[PDB]
Every structure is written in structure tokens, then in C-alpha cells.
Amino acid sequence: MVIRVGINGFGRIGRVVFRAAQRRNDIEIVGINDLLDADYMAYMLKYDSTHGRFEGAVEVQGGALVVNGKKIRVTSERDPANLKWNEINVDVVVESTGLFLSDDTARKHIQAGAKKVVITGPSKDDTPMFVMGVNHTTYKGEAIVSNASCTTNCLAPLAKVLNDKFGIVEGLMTTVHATTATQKTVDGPSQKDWRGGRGAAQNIIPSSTGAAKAVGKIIPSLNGKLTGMAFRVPTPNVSVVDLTVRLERPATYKQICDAIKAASEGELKGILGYVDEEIVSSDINGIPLTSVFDARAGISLNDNFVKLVSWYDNETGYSNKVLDLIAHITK
Amino acid sequence: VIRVGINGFGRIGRVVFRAAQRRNDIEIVGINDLLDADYMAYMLKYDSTHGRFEGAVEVQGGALVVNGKKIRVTSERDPANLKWNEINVDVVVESTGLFLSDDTARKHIQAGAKKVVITGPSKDDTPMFVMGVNHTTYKGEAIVSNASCTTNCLAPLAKVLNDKFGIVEGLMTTVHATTATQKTVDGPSQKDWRGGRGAAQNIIPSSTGAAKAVGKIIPSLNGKLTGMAFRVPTPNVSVVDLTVRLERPATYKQICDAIKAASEGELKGILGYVDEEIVSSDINGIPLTSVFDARAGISLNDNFVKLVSWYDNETGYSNKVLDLIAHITK
Amino acid sequence: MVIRVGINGFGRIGRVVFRAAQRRNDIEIVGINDLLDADYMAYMLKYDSTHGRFEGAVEVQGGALVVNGKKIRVTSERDPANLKWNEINVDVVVESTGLFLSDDTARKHIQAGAKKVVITGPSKDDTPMFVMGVNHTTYKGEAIVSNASCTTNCLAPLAKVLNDKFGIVEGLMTTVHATTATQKTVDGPSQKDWRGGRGAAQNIIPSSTGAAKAVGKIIPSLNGKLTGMAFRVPTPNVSVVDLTVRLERPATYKQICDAIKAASEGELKGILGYVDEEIVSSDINGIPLTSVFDARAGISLNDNFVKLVSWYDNETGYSNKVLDLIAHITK
Amino acid sequence: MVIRVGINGFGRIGRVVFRAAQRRNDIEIVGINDLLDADYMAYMLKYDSTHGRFEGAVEVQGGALVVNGKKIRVTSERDPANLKWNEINVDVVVESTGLFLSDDTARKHIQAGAKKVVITGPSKDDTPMFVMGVNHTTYKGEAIVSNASCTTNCLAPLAKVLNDKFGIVEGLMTTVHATTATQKTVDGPSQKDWRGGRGAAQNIIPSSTGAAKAVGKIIPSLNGKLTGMAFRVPTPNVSVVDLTVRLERPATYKQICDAIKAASEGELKGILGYVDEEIVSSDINGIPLTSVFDARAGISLNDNFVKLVSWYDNETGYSNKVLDLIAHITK
Ligand SMILES: NC(=O)c1ccc[n+]([C@@H]2O[C@H](COP(=O)([O-])OP(=O)(O)OC[C@H]3O[C@@H](n4cnc5c(N)ncnc54)[C@H](O)[C@@H]3O)[C@@H](O)[C@H]2O)c1
Ligand SMILES: NC(=O)c1ccc[n+]([C@@H]2O[C@H](COP(=O)([O-])OP(=O)(O)OC[C@H]3O[C@@H](n4cnc5c(N)ncnc54)[C@H](O)[C@@H]3O)[C@@H](O)[C@H]2O)c1
Ligand SMILES: NC(=O)c1ccc[n+]([C@@H]2O[C@H](COP(=O)([O-])OP(=O)(O)OC[C@H]3O[C@@H](n4cnc5c(N)ncnc54)[C@H](O)[C@@H]3O)[C@@H](O)[C@H]2O)c1
Ligand SMILES: NC(=O)c1ccc[n+]([C@@H]2O[C@H](COP(=O)([O-])OP(=O)(O)OC[C@H]3O[C@@H](n4cnc5c(N)ncnc54)[C@H](O)[C@@H]3O)[C@@H](O)[C@H]2O)c1
């Protein structure tokens, strides 16, 4: 059974989701909505500064996008209620504009004829959030879900392994994060995030994030036990989680590594990765894992206090798991 | 003292504001953007490119207080509603990047201002000026343009060469710093596809009418110059790369001597002359609009030469905007 | 019939040459020399910030490099004379240290048992230089050759088309060039190139280059008709030639484009490329062409005075042509 | 009363120490040693990508540097033993080559006629290290001292306030650090630090650092209670400490801020600073403080577990405190 999917917001996540969908037989992107002509949309798909040339055929024929022989409806509707998803029989919508992160806005896709919606960001409201490999089995057939944030998808699988094996008393996270689309090339206006308005190439830019706290929803036993912040730094992609955590039961650094390696080859296979090499961020570019543990980078103070490092391609990992979630909620 | 309002407190708007603090003939009395006063104070106080504001800044009752002087802060999206007359504004610096024509910029005059300086090249037949090159052609027009940063770098250089040796024809490249219109990662730029690609990752080609506009600034060079741009990942300071054919032969030393002479005479404070192993950040903060790099350029022969001139695209332009304000009110 | 190659200098060119050689049947790398342990060389091959992970297996067995199961001798000899190339029966050495750009230094590989040497930079002496597609047929069986510079391999094919079709009166070139290994992260010492010592990430940095003048040697009819300079800018790879040229016979921009396009499909196929799209530098990353003409980027003042833009991956294009030159000089 | 100082190693620290010395009456730089001609040294002093044009007058007269009316001897001795510091009556040598971080090597300055030496890095041996404002009063008249690291100088004043007021149970530190001269523009050789060889502009690059552990020597009561690591990111200057710490006595975030503010106005005035604004890294560029507490950036999980953020200009702050140490050890 092939799932028919529409994308709203053909941005970094929308376009990276699109490419990943191409390598799957169970998902077909049959419609795309943004504020772009079909020919510009084709160009943005074909050429990518971060992930290179698109491996496939793209043509524009009569205002529709034709990719690898398939016609894809292209629209320019600012209001999702007008998207008429039913006319192309769309099952699930990828909501990746970054503008519609609540039930009252995202449900407009269902009003427009879609059956289900995956929001590609943290919920503004009580829309349930999921992290593949951590709490996806708690899905109950809801029509609208959230795939949480890229950072939460990095921290939660790491947090799960530790909490399961040793238990987490409490933790503080820093994510050192690549530049994103919300940032500015030179000091410019960001009325709700003053620091985020400062030139991205020139600065280390601190930021607030609810991603560590959000892990409390993904892993309920950790509710109120984790929080943190971020530094935005001048790279185009790939980010890293820096988790300082207190453990319930003692664990040597080797034992933590053995536990992470085991989960990476067992239950968290294809989600959590294990690396024991001298890597740097660009070595992670293109990796579809959502959490890549860096064994050599981290350090133990003692058997109950440890700093752990995990990489994530914030575009690619998240995007592949958006597709995993689509397959899961439709199974 | 000329009372000035700024529309668009962006890179140019704010660098103009700082430069004005160091002028005795100009006072900024109103600023319009889409910002609260406290955010506006913050953007002024801290600058990634030019450092901490060299003055006192505070907010008192929804007004900006800078060096003890009160400045009206508004958030009118439509310039027609700016009520410049209520703070007795003479001239408006139009630096939003949105109003580059007579019909749009004239809304400031509808709103009570007397004159308007547009801080970009005109979209229509609004006259453009480059200080030191054609500013004496100003005829009392109420609305003028200060052209572009690139034109302000190229025109003084072209003038010196054209006056002394004459220019047959020339092609220009500007290697340009990143600007606010660009994107941090590949994003939407429907009218400029290349410019939408991530700025930090790329050398990004661009069209520019900046060399061709020198034809309007120096009429004898009409149809004799054109060029393009490469946008590269630096935050500020740009450089002009002019390949030019000369009418009368000149050695490289002779070209340099003419430029040096002009920089000490008629073009003092506009065109500069440097004879050192400099790089772009050495030009950051320089108020000149054209800084000739003697050592960087090269002659093929006595009639064919490549000349290099730096410009702080924020600071030089911004200072000459203020020079143009003083000139058109003189 | 397969040419056995040794690499001296496993730097950017050595390693990109190595990767290009993996996809060729007529050339195999059997030895590498640098100042590195075998396991560090393996790491440098495996992970590449610019060109991503090595597409294959890399391992160390007994002080040797094992790539896709094939053993490669690893040595650490500072003096090329001690390399014992005869012991692994190397035919041709890729001299890519950047230190040995003369007959006197490079011939030490021949003393050490190699038959021929390709120097991967411009000659300091009268060692003959070549650009594939332009003057490679002038090769006369010399034991030591140079593949000229990356910039010269971009300019010469473009200059050749213009010169052949319309004739070049005079020309001035600018290359806007990516950062390279000789540059500095922050202002540091560069006694023979002061500008080049200034922080690379912070600056546009003017530079001298003999690349346009050297095209006068590659294309003798253009001797004394070309020169230029460079600006080094903060990108990691891919550079662009900016050629301002006066033509003998009149040509419209379309006629110039048609000529370049025809050559790219004919005589200069696989050397000179033709692009008619809104590309930026990163789109050229990984392209094995030595010159990629950007039709939309350039501009004519008139039918005899024109500015032409041509891209080049300064690592990949040059490296592939080093291998093309090796194949040619042994044929 | 005026201390006569020679600088060995006119690099980033040497040149920034030099400028800071111009604005002090109690310190005179009377000699500089590097591997540079006098005119190149003049140029390196005059133009600085990070801190702008030098404000004073600089000239070369007969192989000597003349700055603001004072003559400065320029030498090119690779071996410090030959520096003849006595011929220009040098009291203290600033040892900032980065090569001589032990008693055996730094003592060559004393052989060469100097009375005392300040090493501008952490000691490799048992050479005593100091952080101004924290343990400088433990100085006992030693001829050779170390000013520790830039990172230690940021952490120790912050850790001192917390330990004094609330007590530190344990802590783990991350420093997000600007690029330095030891790094590479593109993937290059770094045999003793593989990650550090990777292209700095392209990467977030993890690194080990003993700076947190070293605070155990600066503050003995904290021995074994702190350690940490680093991420090197592509900015030219200014770094930030990210300290996750468990407190003995409970404290609100407000209480932590008030305690740090009080110290910044009292005992640690001019050493530790307090900022309550939406700043980013470039706002700290040029600040001579060694630790600038960012009240708004940090976050508490609870009253005993907190993450604290403190900035530092790694060139300027450290360089100023080098001079403060010179003033102190000669009083
Ligand atoms: N980039 C990451 O690493 C990352 C990771 C995880 C989650 N996210 C989240 O995904 C969402 C999008 O992120 P992004 O990086 O792709 O941003 P983006 O700016 O690159 O993409 C947003 C796209 O939506 C388009 N758009 C804007 N308004 C629209 C409208 N009314 N209707 C239809 N399309 C519209 C825009 O043209 C743009 O192309 C955000 O919520 C983000 O927080 C991003
Ligand atoms: N940055 C340069 O180097 C440079 C040099 C010369 C000329 N210019 C030109 O100056 C103009 C502004 O350029 P910039 O770099 O300062 O861009 P910018 O984006 O930094 O500044 C634009 C400012 O205008 C504000 N604004 C947007 N809409 C507004 C509205 N309706 N009303 C009032 N304010 C509004 C924006 O919030 C922003 O602060 C452009 O036309 C530009 O081409 C720029
Ligand atoms: N990078 C480019 O874009 C490019 C293009 C064309 C030509 N070239 C030229 O090729 C040559 C190499 O350039 P690069 O960018 O690869 O520099 P690089 O620094 O990246 O590589 C040089 C390598 O040689 C090693 N080496 C140094 N001394 C050695 C010795 N005595 N014996 C053996 N190995 C030694 C070094 O450890 C290093 O790994 C230069 O001449 C360069 O100008 C470079
Ligand atoms: N840069 C920082 O942020 C920082 C902060 C604190 C401490 N430090 C430390 O200070 C020391 C220098 O740091 P840096 O950033 O200034 O490095 P740097 O590379 O900028 O300076 C080193 C200087 O020493 C010169 N030199 C090399 N060998 C020499 C020799 N035999 N004799 C005389 N001079 C020689 C070099 O030419 C160079 O100019 C290092 O130990 C560093 O860890 C650096």
C-alpha cells in the first residue's frame, strides 16, 4: 500500500523530506504547496548547497512538477484551508512551513480534504509529539501529530538508553546548532528573538530551546528532569547535543558506551548510531540517523556524573523520521 | 542644522545614524521602522560589524534618547502616514530598500518633509548623484538618489582615469560582501534565484546596473561601461575590479600618480590612495567611497589595465548620504 | 597495461587524485608517501570535509593501507630520493607535496626507481607544462612534466575556444578563488606573501598569480596577450575565472556561447563544460571538468569586448586531469 | 617603577599583549623576538583583522621598531638562549611562541639575561600557574610562572564566586571556542590532534581541554570536582564557557546572579564582568575582562543544579591579565 503525501512548505525540511521520499517505495509525494512557481520549485529541488545535486529527473510540464516520471501538483495557497488535498487523494500532509504548529491551524489540511497531518516542529499546543524509537508506539490513531524538533529527536533516544539502563536523576543539555533559515546574514530585525537577529556568520549566538524539556513529554518518567539551551554557530548544517547528566546507578564511561552501542545495534537500530572515531560535524552530513553518539568526545567526572556528546544532521535525520512517522501512523 | 528623519533603520539606516552623530550640520530627529523603541535602542547599541555605539543610548517613554537628545520612534508601514511635519523634519533618508521611485519616495513629502534622499539606485528617472563626481549638477530637485555603493566606488575612479587619459571602454567586476537581502541557507528569492542560495557556502554571481549607471553619473561614459558581481561570504567591505581600455597611453606608475594626485586634491575625502599589502577588513570603517589599491592592480600594456579599488559598502555610502543631504540643502 | 602510480604528498590534491583513481581501471595507486602514520592516512582518506565520506572500505593491515581489500604501501620519507619506488614497481609518481616543482627536486623520484613524474603545480624551471585538451599533444616523451595550475587548466580551454573561433587581441583575468591550505585561520606569518597571512575567513584577500601569463606558454599565439590577478575568498572549494577579453573578429554573446557549447560537445568534451542555469559555486563541487562556462553570468559590452565567467572545482577537475595526463604520457 | 618587558613570539597573544601595553604606564615593551623582519613586524602590528588599525605611530628605523616615540629592538633568534635580554635591560619576558611551556625551555630567557618569565599558556610541568583575582596572592617570588589558559581564566573567576558563596559539589564544563592559529583552513595534517586538522570554517570540531581540571590547581578545594571539553567553531575571536554545576547550598538563579554581580563590582572588579542583555559573541570583542557572565543566557533546572554562561575575548582578556600578572610578580 502506497501512501499519498502532500508537502506544505517546500523549505529545507520540505525539500529534504522530498528527496528522502524518492528512495522509498511506500510513499509518493503527489502535491507540493509553497509560494513559488513550478520552475523555481524545480530549481530549488535540483541544486542544493548542502546536499548536492538531485539524483533524478525533473521537468516542468504545464505548471506541474514531473519528477522521475510522476506528475506532482504545484500550488501557491497561503491558506491551507483552500488546498483541496482531496482532488489529488492525499492521505497525509507534511506541514513544514513552520507557521502552523497547533491543532487549530494544522487541522485546516483535514478541512481541505487530507486524512492526517504530520507537523514538522514542536507543538504550540497539546498536539502529541513523537520521536521514532522512543514513544512512537504510544500513537493512538490521532489525525494530527508532531514529529517534535530536530534537537529532541537527538536527545530523546540518547536519554532513553541512559534512563532505561542507569536511570537519569537530572540533566542539563546544550545544543551547538548549525545556522538555519530563521537567522540573518547581517544584523537584522528579529523582534521576538533579538540575539537571533544578529549576523549569523559573525557570531556565536545563544538561544533558548524547549527541546530538552520536551523530552519530558516524549519520556514521561523524565518530566521536569531535563532542560537546556543552545548556541547557534556559523555552519550550514549538522548540530550536536552536549548532555550533562546525573545517573541514578553508577556507570563507568565504558559501560555507558557498551549500552549505547547495544541499543544502536538492537532496539534503536537505524535511529541511534555509535561512532568511535575522530569525527567532526561535516562527517555527519547526509546521515539519516537522528542521534549519533560520539564515544571519544564525551567525558566522565565520576560514575554518577557524565557529559555525553551526540551528533545529528538537523535536516536529514529529522526528515527521514518524518517519513518513518508517516509510515507508522498509516500502518 | 538640518533636521533629518530616517525611514528604514537597517544597515544603511543605522550606519547613517552613527555617522550623523559626528556631524555638526545634521540632526536625526525621527526614525521609522517596524521596531519598538527598546529594540531600536538595542540594534543601535550593539553592532557585529562596527562595534559598540560610541555614545549614550537609553529609552525614555517610548522615545529613543541618544546623547541626551530625544528622537521620535514610529512604526508606520506606509510613508504617507509619517507626519514628518510634526517633528519639523527637513530631509528624509529613505533607506528601507522599498521606495526607489518618485511616486513612492514622494510620500515623505506628502507626509510633510521637504526633500528625500533615496539610498539606492533609482527605479525610474529620479536623478542619481555621486559626491565629488556629479553633485554639482544638482538643480534643487526635491527627490534625489545617492546611487549605489558600487557606483560610488566606481565613479570616482572612472572620473580620474577619464579626465586624465580618457576611457575607451571598460568592464567591471565587484567582489561584494554579503548583504541583508541574502539568505543564511538555500531559501526563496523569486526575483534573484542565485541570491537565494546560502551565503556562507557560496560564491554567488549577480547582475548589477552599477557600472552602467556610471554612464548616467558621467555622461561621456554612457554606453562605455558595464559589469557584474560576485557575492562572497564576508560581512562587510567590497572591492571593485575594473578592466579598462585607455585612449591615451599610460604606464602603471602614471595611472597611480594621477589617482594619488586626485586623492590629495579635488577628490580628497572621497577617493583614497593606498600603497600597502592590505586586505578587506583593513577598509572596515573607512568613510571614503573609493579606496585605490595601488599594489593589487596590473597593466597588460599602456592602454589596457586592471585597477582595484576597495569600499566599505556600509560606511562610505552612509557618510556620502549625509554629504548629499548637506549639499542639497546648501 | 595498467599504470602503477605512487603519490608523494597525500594533501588535498594527493587525496582527491586518490579518490578519482578509484573509479579508473587504467590507473592504480600502489604507494603513498607523506609525513603520517598509516592509520592517520587512512583517517584522512575516509573523512573529507569537502567531498564527504570515502565511497569504499579503508583499513590498516601491518603498516599498510588496505582500500577495498587491496594493499597500498605507506611510507614517511621526507627526502624523495629514499622512496624506493622500484620495490613496488611504480611507473609514474604524482608529485603533490608542493615542495618539489623543479627538475632537480622531482628527478629524485627517478633516482628512487620511478620512470616518470607528474608535478601537480606550475614549474619553477623549464619543466614543460601541460593542459589536457589544449597542448597535451605537444608531449614528446619527457620523463618529468607539470600539469600547470588549477587556474591555468580553467582559463586555457576557454581561451582556446575564443582564440580559435574569434581570435584574442588582449585579455585580463581575475580569478575569485577558494581558500587553500597555504592560507591562515587567523592573522599569522606569511613572509613571502603578507596579504596571504591575514585571516582567511575574515577577508577578501588580493593575490598575485602567473596563471594568465602562463596560458601564453600553453597557447604560444597568446604569449604576452594575457595577465591577471586573484582574490582569495572564504569558501572551502570551487573557484571561478573572470576573463575580460578583446576579440579580433566580432561576436555576439550568443555566438560566443554557441562556440563554447559546440566545443564542450566536441573537441573539449569532458574538459570544458557549458552551463545555462542560475548556479552558484557549490553546484560545481565534485565536477571533474577543468572549466565550466557559466553562460548567464557573463556579459558583453559590445561585439569585440566581453566578460566571460568559467567555474572550476580547483581540487577535483585538476586532479582528474592529472590522471588523464598520466594516461597520456604513458600511451 | 616601570617594568621593562621583552616579547618572545609576536603572534596573536604577543601582538595583542603589545597593544594593551601601550595603554599602561607601568609596562614598557623594549624588545620583540619572532622570525620576522622589522618591517613585516610593523605591518603585523599596524593591521589586524580582528581588532582593527593600530592607533599609534609605527616606523622602522635602522632595523628597530619605533612605536609612539619609543625604540624597540627587533631580533630573529630561534634559540631563546641567544636573545641577550640584558643588553636592553629586560625585567620580564612574555613567552608567547607556544613552544616553550616548561621550566627547562622558558629558563633560557633567564640565561639570556632576563629576571623573570611569564609563559602565556598552561604549564607542561610543575611550573606554577596563576589566574588574576583568584590565586595570584599565592605567588611566592618564583622567576618562572604561567598565566594558565584563556579558558581557565574564564572559568576560575566564575567558579570562585559559586564555590565561595554556595559551594560546588561537582561540575562539567564546555567551552565553545573561536578558531585559533593552530587550526587549518582546509582538511590538513595534525598528527597529535586529528579533529583539529579538519577545515575550521566547515566544521564544529570537538577538542579535549584540561582547562576545567586545571581550575583544581587554581582553586585547590575544587581539585577533582571539575572537568570538561571544547567545541571549536568557525569564528575569528571570542569564546564562551558553558558550566553545568551542582551546588552544596541551594540558590535561585536570581541569587546566583546577585552574587556574581556583587563580585564583579567588588573583589573581582575588572576581572569578572556582569551582563544582563541580549548579547552575542562579537559584542565581547575587545573586552579586557577575563570572564563576562551572561545572566540571560543561563538556566536553572532547580536550586542546586544550574547551567551558567560566561564569555571571554580569548585574545584580549588573557593578554591584559598577562600584563596584570607582570605588574604583580614585580611589586
Ligand atoms: N532546518 C532544521 O534543521 C529543522 C529541524 C527540525 C525542525 N525544523 C522545523 O521545520 C519547519 C520548517 O523549517 P525549515 O528549516 O524547512 O524552514 P524554511 O524557511 O527553510 O522553509 C519554510 C518554507 O515554507 C514556505 N512558506 C512560507 N509561508 C508559507 C505559506 N503560508 N504557505 C505555504 N508555504 C509557505 C516558505 O517559502 C519556505 O520555503 C520549522 O518549524 C522548523 O523549526 C527545522
Ligand atoms: N547594505 C549595503 O551595503 C548598501 C549599500 C548601499 C545601498 N544600499 C541600499 O540601501 C537600502 C537599504 O539597504 P540595507 O542594507 O540597509 O537593508 P536592511 O534590510 O538592513 O534595512 C532595511 C530596513 O528597513 C526596515 N523596513 C522594512 N520595511 C519597512 C517599512 N515599510 N517602513 C519602514 N521600515 C521598513 C526593515 O525592518 C530594515 O530594518 C537598499 O535599497 C540597499 O540596496 C545598501
Ligand atoms: N588545492 C588546489 O586547489 C590546487 C590545485 C592545483 C594545484 N595545486 C598545487 O598542488 C600542490 C599541493 O597542494 P595542496 O592543496 O594539496 O597542499 P596540501 O598542504 O593540502 O598538501 C601537501 C601535502 O604534502 C605533505 N608533505 C609536506 N612535505 C612533505 C614531504 N617532504 N614529503 C612528503 N610529503 C610531504 C604534507 O603533509 C601535505 O599533506 C601545490 O603545489 C598546489 O599549488 C593545488
Ligand atoms: N590565541 C588565543 O586565543 C590564546 C589564548 C590564551 C593562550 N594562548 C596561547 O599563547 C601561545 C601563542 O598563542 P597564539 O594564538 O598567539 O599563537 P600564534 O601562532 O598566533 O603566535 C605564535 C608566534 O610565535 C612565532 N614563533 C614561532 N616559533 C618561534 C620561535 N622559535 N622563536 C620566536 N618566535 C617564534 C611565530 O612566528 C608566531 O608569530 C600559545 O601557547 C597559546 O595556546 C592563546
Ligand SMILES: [Mg+2]
Ligand atoms: Mg517514493
Ligand SMILES: [Mg+2]
Ligand atoms: Mg584505480
Ligand SMILES: [Mg+2]
Ligand atoms: Mg606602556
